[PDB]
Amino acid sequence: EIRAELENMASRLADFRGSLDLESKEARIAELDEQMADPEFWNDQQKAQTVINEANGLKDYVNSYKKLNESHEELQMTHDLLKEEPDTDLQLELEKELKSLTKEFNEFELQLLLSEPYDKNNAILELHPGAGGTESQDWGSMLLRMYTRWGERRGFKVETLDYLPGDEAGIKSVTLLIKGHNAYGYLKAEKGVHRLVRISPFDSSGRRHTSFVSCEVMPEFNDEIDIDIRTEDIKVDTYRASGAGGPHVNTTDSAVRITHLPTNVVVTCQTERSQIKNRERAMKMLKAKLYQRRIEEQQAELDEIRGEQKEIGWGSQIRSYVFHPYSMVKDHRTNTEMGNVQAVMDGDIDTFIDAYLRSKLS
RNA sequence: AGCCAGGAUGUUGGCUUAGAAGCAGCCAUCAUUUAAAGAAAGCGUAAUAGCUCACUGGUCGAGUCGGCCUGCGCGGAAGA
RNA sequence: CGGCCGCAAGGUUAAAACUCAAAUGAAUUGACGGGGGCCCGCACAAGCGGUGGAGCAUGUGGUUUAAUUCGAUGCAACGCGAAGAACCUUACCUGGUCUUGACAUCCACGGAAGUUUUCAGAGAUGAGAAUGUGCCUUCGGGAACCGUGAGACAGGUGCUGCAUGGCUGUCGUCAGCUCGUGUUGUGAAAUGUUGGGUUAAGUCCCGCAACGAGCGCAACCCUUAUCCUUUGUUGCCAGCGGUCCGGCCGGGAACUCAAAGGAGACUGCCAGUGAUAAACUGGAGGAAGGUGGGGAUGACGUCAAGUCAUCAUGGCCCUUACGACCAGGGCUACACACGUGCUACAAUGGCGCAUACAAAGAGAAGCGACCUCGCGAGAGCAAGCGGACCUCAUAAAGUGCGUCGUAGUCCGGAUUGGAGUCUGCAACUCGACUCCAUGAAGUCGGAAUCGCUAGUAAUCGUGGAUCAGAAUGCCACGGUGAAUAC
RNA sequence: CCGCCG
RNA sequence: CGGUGAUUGGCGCAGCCUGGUAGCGCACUUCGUUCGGGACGAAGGGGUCGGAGGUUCGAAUCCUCUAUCACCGACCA
């Protein structure tokens, strides 16, 4: 009730003892605080202004881990005294002490694991059954079940934007929307195909069926926050339009060209018998491509997201779910494994996500 | 108004920091000597450092310096 | 593509790269056909009663959970393993504990073992405190266990039934499946096994490049239906005597019955049909007539079907833990879906009173008369019985009378409150039964679907296994008892 | 009469 | 720009015009059929009518603007 939280914090701190590699960090701090005593490195500011920032950025972790370790040990000795001298007055305060320590610890994890930009977003996850018939469809439905059982246990909202069933069994496609606070910061660990080795119940011979379901998971934006541009120079021009068959070429100028300093957007409106409505409709066709290029840059960023690490041969294959011969779930980037596959398929991929972020943080 | 001095205390404190010291900040934002001095108003320093300012004494030899109401002017004020 | 020809459609002549390791022909065996012939099976038809609607019981899927252990999961999983989960079982979860260990063998050491009582603890455990200290004798010394230490090991309901054995389902109790020798074909193969009849049957007869054989079919086995011989109890009472009229007692061995041993039924006989055949139809007789009824009996194989969780087992893997011990919980959760059942919706019925007729089985920490007490479940005292003797044990539908008079009603009996009984350390999660009270849905069930050919379906009760307690399931038993098959 | 697929 | 006519289930359309009274087909859900899938049956759910404000006891419906959508005209010099 108290000592189990200490015994689990002692395992959760070695996660960051390995995932930070603290001896390298204190060696870096030691080789900075020996050389920054001489004033020649802080003479010209253009190196020391980044050197003090890097020194503080490593100093943050090499104080925070030792602070969490000392606040672990001073409660460990206190609980050993409570299991040694039975102070029920100290056992009243130790529960609030453990509550405050867990409130600090999971907050610290949320600091250092999630420095990436699109971690606050809602992870639009998407499953494709890879290749084949009704076993790779069933594996897509099993992965759907595991991800919804993780999202609702996490308290997130699974919206299921798109869906497509399988013909006999399984699914053929699904596109979810996982409304959550740190949704993409957790579901970064799901990019890549999943491998399922089992015996197909849709078989008859009992062949071991190995199956591959691809999972592409993006962060969503739904931003749609763009109104005007006017803080730059909207270089406009009024000129006689390119036309015949009227009094425009004889008398007056109606056409409106608009030129922008952002990305050189130039728009012409020339065919409405009055210059003023050409300005108004040229403003409409200003926004009618400013929003379009906004979608182009959103799509161009997200295409880099969906093409970050899609070149490694077998390293794109993570998460082997062995069912039939020996029943183990293994991750092929972090090298961790859980032998109870049913608790994994019921949605306890939390360890496989924390090991992923703890590996990619180092 | 000038000119000459002084313009100092426990004192660098609890933090953002290898250190934030009267002036990148948020609190404490005061007790001493006096004729007076803000754990300081400004420049300046990575910060300290320097430099002035408030304020206070000496020469000086009398009117000064701001705010309101008004009269008349000034700039704003470039075309074939 | 180029040439020639053509009004055109196009014809004729005619490549290459690339690509694959085959494409193709004829024949053989199977399988398949919305090809053909013949034949069959509750297959359809002819009927009867259901399931799907309702409420509950049980199992499964999902969902939930700390865990809802594991397995089967078209037919051929889903009242299945489980012939019975409160603890145990239990394999699962949470917490507390142990490590050569709960269970084995070996080594060394100390003590007989054993019995009683207290403290702490949820208990496992640890601390104790007394009694005891048997038979050997090399009587330092052993058989017996206890306790400790060390390690070979032990342990695993951990994995793989797609490494296996054994056991099982299945097509299917369907009538097939093969072989030896011979002959035929270059060969795969074929023939036998096909054909005419016939049969429940590759059953039999006849023919025939086949001749034979084997596993199957049939019979041999159990049971049931009739009779006879023996024996006559704790079973029976036909004839006599008494009877308190109860086979109750003398008696009897008749009969029912009990069991052992035989007989009987084989198309045997008759007639007709049919190849002078097998057989088929009909009749006599007989208790039974055409394998009399029912069972057991499961061919070569099929499904890499099921089970490594009954056991055994090759190989992996854990080994101060995936092993071991305990307490509590869970296996019984509940937006929902399915399977299999029980109870109903009533008048061919409900209730009240009276009254008749069974079979089969179980029983010694067991079945438990009588009598008393209790409305009752039951309780007390307590016979008899290791059982043709005693007990379970009242069969109920049935019949006679009365009443209800078609209403959600004297139908239904779920759900819930209160009071209890018993089992077991213990009935909260979660037992069964009783009493009082309550009185839900339900008024005959959509598409769809199941079983059954005669003592069958339908309905009615009884008993057993498992089991301290805990069947609406399973396995057996008798009562009444059909409709229909053109 | 209608009877597609694996 | 105005003129003119529409926004009803997840989709395509009704209903509006006449003030009370939202349905059709597909699709979805469950059950059935099937070795399974489709097809086919049998049950069942489905929207508070673009938004806002008035008329009235009452508005999806009658007006009023605001948004969106499509058609028509935007002329002569």
Curated annotation (Swiss-Prot):
Gene3D superfamilies: 3.30.160.20, 3.30.70.1660, Release factor (1.20.58.410). InterPro entries: PCRF, Pep_chain_release_fac_I, Pep_chain_release_fac_I_sf, PrfB. GO terms for cellular component: cytoplasm. It is found in: Cytoplasm. Pfam families: PCRF (PF03462), RF-1 (PF00472). Belongs to the prokaryotic/mitochondrial release factor family. GO terms for biological process: viral translational frameshifting. The modification N5-methylglutamine is found at P247. This is Peptide chain release factor 2. Methylated by PrmC. Methylation increases the termination efficiency of RF2. One of its GO terms (molecular function) is translation release factor activity, codon specific. The gene for this protein contains a UGA in-frame termination codon after Leu-20; a naturally occurring frameshift enables complete translation of RF-2. This provides a mechanism for the protein to regulate its own production. Keywords: Cytoplasm, Methylation, Protein biosynthesis. Its main location: cytoplasm. Peptide chain release factor 2 directs the termination of translation in response to the peptide chain termination codons UGA and UAA. SMART domains: PCRF (SM00937).
